[PDB]
Amino acid sequence: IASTMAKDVRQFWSNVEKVVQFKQQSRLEEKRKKALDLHLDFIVGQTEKYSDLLSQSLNTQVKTPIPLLLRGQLREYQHIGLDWLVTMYEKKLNGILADEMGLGKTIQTISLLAHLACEKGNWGPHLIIVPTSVMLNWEMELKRWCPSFKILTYYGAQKERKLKRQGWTKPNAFHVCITS
């Protein structure tokens, strides 16, 4: 009888502690809510301040021409995006290009690399991570538009990958690497 009593009382106080846990969870959600809302205004304000600071140095009109490395002409929106990417680079920010599919984001990035190579003298090792289905497409687009980049397509079995990595740390071994 006393064990039944203890079980009943323990269930009752488990319900009481469940109520207390609901209370503490409601208080945490408030802290979670204000913490989420507070930092949102912080990260947002900081990002917008950095973008406004970035748009402050624009002359707007495009300043960058079609770099010498390009063998073909660039569209109007492509040239505008190239100028925007060059501004982002000059001001040391990272970029997200959300142009609709088919607008030549590949060509825009290739023109950005062309500018960095011609005017800034930086032809780095430029890593490019793309889906396995478009590695050949990126390689062909690079060979087509910018023929001066040393392209290294990182594909094949492990042994082939090791063979390609042999001596790849040397300077100027390759300019742009394309991987999946």
Binding site: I43, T47, G95, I96, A98, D99, E100, K105, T109
Partner: peptide, 20 residues
């Protein structure tokens, strides 16, 4: 480089921004 809109999840947006 993205071809789809970033309107699917605030968590995905935060991940992409933190990576940026």
């Amino acid at each position: 480089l993205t071809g789809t809109p970033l309107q699917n999840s605030l968590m995905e947006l935060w991940s992409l921004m933190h990576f940026l």
